[PDB]
Design a protein around this ligand. Structure first.
Ligand SMILES: [Zn+2]
Ligand SMILES: [Zn+2]
Ligand SMILES: [Zn+2]
Lengths: 50, 82, 99, 61, 237, 88
RNA sequence: ACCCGAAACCGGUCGAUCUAGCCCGGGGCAGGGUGAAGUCCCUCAACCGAGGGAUGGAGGCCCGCUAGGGGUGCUGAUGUG
RNA sequence: GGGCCAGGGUUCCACGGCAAUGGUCGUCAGCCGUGGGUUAGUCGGUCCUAACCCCGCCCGUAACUCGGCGCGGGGGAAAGGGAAACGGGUUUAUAUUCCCGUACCGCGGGGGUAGGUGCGGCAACGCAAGCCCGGAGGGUGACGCCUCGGGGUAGGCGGACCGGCCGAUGAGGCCGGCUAAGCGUAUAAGCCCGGGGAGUGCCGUAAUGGCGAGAACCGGGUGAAAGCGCGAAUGGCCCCCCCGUUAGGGGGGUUCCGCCGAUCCCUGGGGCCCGUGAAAAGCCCUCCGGGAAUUCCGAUCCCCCGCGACCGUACCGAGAACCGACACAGGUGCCCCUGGGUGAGAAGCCUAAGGCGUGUCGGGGGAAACCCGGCCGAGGGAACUCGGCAAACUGGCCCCGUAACUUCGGGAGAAGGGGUGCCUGCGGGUGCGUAACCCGCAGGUCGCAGUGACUAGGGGGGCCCGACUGUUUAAUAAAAA
RNA sequence: GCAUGAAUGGCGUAACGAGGUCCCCGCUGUCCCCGGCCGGGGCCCGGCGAAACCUCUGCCUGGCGCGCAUGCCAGGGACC
């Protein structure tokens, strides 16, 4: 964990950037149709694939 | 150094049996003595490893028996070869 | 602010140490370890033998004893005849080996 | 033993890591091959007709 | 049924493999082309304890520049000179062809065929006796008591292997046995077939007795040769 | 401490800094003294040090100024005598 | 072959982070006791010998809530913990 | 409590919040939202090789992605080997990485010098002691277990003195009184080198021991951890004063003695193995051949200058940041470290530093019966029960004393008996010491009880089985197996 | 010796054992014979807030009955 390879670090970075909420303007544009995406994650409950 | 019978096998206490203790004591008593050096002729030979002996005065190192510097077969072959 | 540390005082310990130096708090009812645990064996022998060797060398240097007597007393000290240099001096006085 | 206390010793090196060829986390790191596509053990892909995973990948079953 | 220990040993698993990386190396003679028709002189540099050999080893440096490992004979001295070849003098630690070794001599490390490197009489405390010499063969009495014929050109070393009497002292402790057998990775401790299960051994069963005679035929298949194999007789005579 | 420093091949020393902090200093152990090639007794004139310490010194401060510095004086004199006698 | 249910058999593959064995490289075990081999010393006698005093630290040794490891009894608590 | 792996992957920091999550509430949060945060020539990977693995040729197989010996190549350790940095300061969150100060290592260059062509010692050796290419040898790297002596450093204790606080502006107690790498500098043991020539023997150690194959004894050489000097008092720490509306500015000191002393470093002995406790890279030295050099070549020595790539670096590190579905009393990691008193003790108990009141639902109560955990119980003392299950007795230390049997080692702390506090004063051991530790003696005195709490064996006699230490059914059997 | 026996070993055995077994001193709430006291639950109040399980129901005596009925027959009793 202290010592990390660059490729694994980049994959973790991609997952971290993925984990965020749907934009409010996206919700407004879709008219309350798109409220969430299947990539939401909680670091202590749902773990990463790697 | 003051034991009637156990000798070197006194470290075992009351274990391993009379015959085994006697054999260990006899072998160790014969081994841990000082033996005559084949080179300098003085009693300064000590066992370094199994079958390896070294003199403490002149530093001569030679190969011998497991527990004695010379075995009967070694003595016989040395006598034959002269 | 940084509050000052409330250090632990050693006044009672100092008082008890003074009383023990005088001779108090030292009876058989205040000991928990073995006698050899309290005053070990190899260290006691080392102190005794080193004191004896130092005394013998000092006497030889002052020439109060000869070389043969020094050798004999060295052998006796190694053998453990003398438990202290008071006994060593008692032996010297008794046998008249001091000049 | 054999249960909850046993499961606490999973803090060592993982058995399988990500594979550079197929992209799945199935590469046997100690041995040096992939348990899914056979990377590091064969030039050709590991396909078995009793397996439906490669068909599931492209919805061809 | 399940496999036997002997059956599992033949698969070469690390449970049964010899740890041939902590040892000092194989003890073989110098190639026969050097020894034939020429005599080489070497000096003993060091005598060491080989972890698994049952005999001390020695390092010999020859005048041609070759460094070799030999089995040290009893009485071998560090810094002494030795000779290998047809013209070598008859002394302990010298290697000669069996044709040049006088009868009644003690030898060890005898080549089965000329130039193989030595195969016989290598354990500690062992020696062989030269019995007769002929232009076609040389007879030697081996430690097992068998009289064996060797080619006259087979090489042997004069003397007795150091380390004899090793069995005079008992092992005493299971820990001592553990260290002794772990040094060479020999299967220890060992179980008993009578206390094994029926699935595991021919003698296995709930009652701890062999259900059949313990003398097994020479023609028995693998997985069956247990007990006394092709025994001519049993018991104490 | 780190697992690399938990190894006993490192020398650990507790040091107080000028600012009042307590820190641990780690060092590698020095090599043992050189030994004669023939008898194995310690040599003279060869300082002990790690490769950096050895490279920190000039050439003449690492070995004595006499023939065969890899041998103790007794072995050196013996070898010289044998060579001289063998030449004649 | 109206519908559901077996224990089981067979092929190809996946697993020694649990656990079993073995190999290479590493970390650890407060304090105390007993006193084997070994090395001796002193006194009285001397044809024998007898007595006293040391040193030495061995052990699959002993006591031990050191750390660590194990799991005998209470068939104790808990036993939708 | 402090540090930090694996694993987790943003959980780290600030601000703005309480719809949901948190065993209750919540204005709080490891939760939600919005903005941020990980800076290296010196730390680690990167290099070497170990157990071992892969690829090519080859052989087998109907064949292969399957099996395999031998040759050639490669890989393989973030706790093995292995070039080089340590203080102070700075941010909300990074610092051996940023800033300041002082250094070191590798490569390349410039100017000098030693050497090429130089000396001092009987010697051990002291020395700047030529450059470039190739090879060989030696050393180092490089090693087990047990045990002891010597040297040193952290840390601790007592006393003096200067500031501050408390105390009664009494006695006394407490707090601060600090010093990194790097550079220069030398002795101890061990091993040597000259002189010297012993035994009705001398010499030495804790112990073993050494001597005409060269001892006492007199000189010297080489050789560690450390200490000392610069770094370094313009720094850090403590105290005092003026300004204090915000914001700031100055003045003082930071010194000695004695004792203990490591599980932390260095260095030597001894003992044990039917057990022998890694390799290679790298570095140092020496020796062989070859090449250039005279109005010239040229350093391992001095000064100066330039360059030094890629990746990790936040945070927890666990009775809430890992695994076990959980903010799980388990496991991983107790993996590395520990002030004072009592005490043999890293035991128990109290306490300093540090941390916490989050091993997280609170309030009430003679508010019962009953259950779990704990204390006591008159007379009897196993009459209970399958069975003394459970509980109880004993308990540390000192001194007397100790059986059958025996493998002579043991049994054994057998059994059994006496003493133990406090105060006053002497004597002894080692010691220069009226420093420190330990061992005795006499007297006085108090209680029911003096190992007063804490710590802390009950014991003995027959029989069966297995010699013993050890191993086993992870999750009903620990045994005679 | 229903039906022991000599390396599927026979007999004996010091030391050792959380192994099975009998006895003795001492000790005690194991017991005669149980009684007090403390802390946590239990109980009440404010909060969060389930699960196992559930044909519908649910009083007795003597009987019939697939032979031991809350539910049928004859009696008895019963406010929620
Ligand atoms: Zn000799
Ligand atoms: Zn793959
Ligand atoms: Zn030499």
């Amino acid at each position: 964990a202290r010592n990390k390879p660059l490729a694994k670090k980049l994959r973790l970075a991609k997952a971290l950037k993925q984990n965020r909420r749907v934009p409010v303007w996206v919700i407004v544009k879709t008219n309350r149709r798109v409220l969430t995406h299947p990539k939401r994650r909680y670091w202590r409950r749902t773990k990463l694939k790697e | 150094s003051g034991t009637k019978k156990v000798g070197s096998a006194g470290r075992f206490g009351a274990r391993y049996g009379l015959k085994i203790r006697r054999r260990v004591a006899a072998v160790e008593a014969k081994m841990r003595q000082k033996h005559t050096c084949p080179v300098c002729g003085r009693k300064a030979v000590k066992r370094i490893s199994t079958g390896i002996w070294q003199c403490q005065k002149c530093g001569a190192t030679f190969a011998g028996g497991a527990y004695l510097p010379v075995t009967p077969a070694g003595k016989a072959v040395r006598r034959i070869t002269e | 602010k940084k509050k000052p540390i409330k250090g632990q005082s050693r006044y009672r310990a100092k008082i008890r140490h003074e009383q023990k130096k005088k001779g108090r708090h030292r009876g058989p009812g205040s000991r928990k370890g073995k006698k050899t645990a309290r005053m070990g064996k190899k260290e006691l022998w080392i102190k005794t033998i080193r004191a004896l060797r130092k005394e013998l060398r000092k006497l030889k240097a002052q020439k109060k004893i000869d070389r043969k007597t020094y050798r004999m007393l060295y052998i006796r000290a190694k053998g453990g005849q003398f438990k202290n240099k008071h006994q060593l001096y008692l032996f010297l006085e008794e046998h008249g080996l001091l000049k | 033993g054999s249960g909850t206390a046993t499961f606490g010793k999973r803090n060592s090196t993982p058995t399988h890591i990500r594979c550079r060829r197929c992209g799945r986390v199935s590469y046997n790191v100690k041995k040096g091959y992939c348990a899914a596509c056979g990377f590091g053990r064969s030039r050709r892909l590991r396909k078995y007709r009793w397996s439906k995973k490669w068909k599931k990948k492209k919805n061809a079953h | 049924g399940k496999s036997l220990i002997q059956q599992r040993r033949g698969k070469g698993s690390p449970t049964f493999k010899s740890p041939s990386h902590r040892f000092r190396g194989a003890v073989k003679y110098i190639p026969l082309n050097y020894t034939q028709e020429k005599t080489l002189r070497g000096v003993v540099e060091e005598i060491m304890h080989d972890p698994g050999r049952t005999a001390p080893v020695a390092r010999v440096k020859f005048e041609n520049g070759i460094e070799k490992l030999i089995i040290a004979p009893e009485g071998l001295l560090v810094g002494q000179e030795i000779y290998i070849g047809p013209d070598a003098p008859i002394a302990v630690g010298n290697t000669l062809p069996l044709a040049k070794i006088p009868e009644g001599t003690y030898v060890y490390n005898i080549e089965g065929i000329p130039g193989d490197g030595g195969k016989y009489v290598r354990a500690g405390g062992t020696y062989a006796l030269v019995v007769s010499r002929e232009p076609d063969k040389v007879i030697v009495q081996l430690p097992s008591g068998e009289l064996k014929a060797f080619n006259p050109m087979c090489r042997a070393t004069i003397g007795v292997v150091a380390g004899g009497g090793r069995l005079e002292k008992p092992l005493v402790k299971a820990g001592k046995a553990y260290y002794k057998y772990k040094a060479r990775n020999k299967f220890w401790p060992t179980p008993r077939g009578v206390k094994m299960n029926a699935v595991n051994h021919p003698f296995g069963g709930k009652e701890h007795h062999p259900g059949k005679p313990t003398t097994t035929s020479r023609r028995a298949p693998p997985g069956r040769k247990v007990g006394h194999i092709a025994a001519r007789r049993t018991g104490r005579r | 401490m780190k697992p690399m420093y938990r190894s006993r091949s490192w020398r650990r020393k507790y040091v107080r800094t000028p600012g009042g902090r307590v820190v641990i200093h780690f060092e590698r152990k020095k090599p043992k003294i050189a030994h004669c090639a023939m008898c194995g007794r310690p040599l003279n004139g060869i300082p002990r040090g790690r490769p950096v310490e050895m490279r920190k010194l000039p050439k003449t401060k690492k070995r004595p100024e006499r023939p065969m510095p890899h041998l103790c004086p007794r072995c050196m004199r013996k070898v010289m005598k044998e060579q001289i006698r063998a030449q004649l």
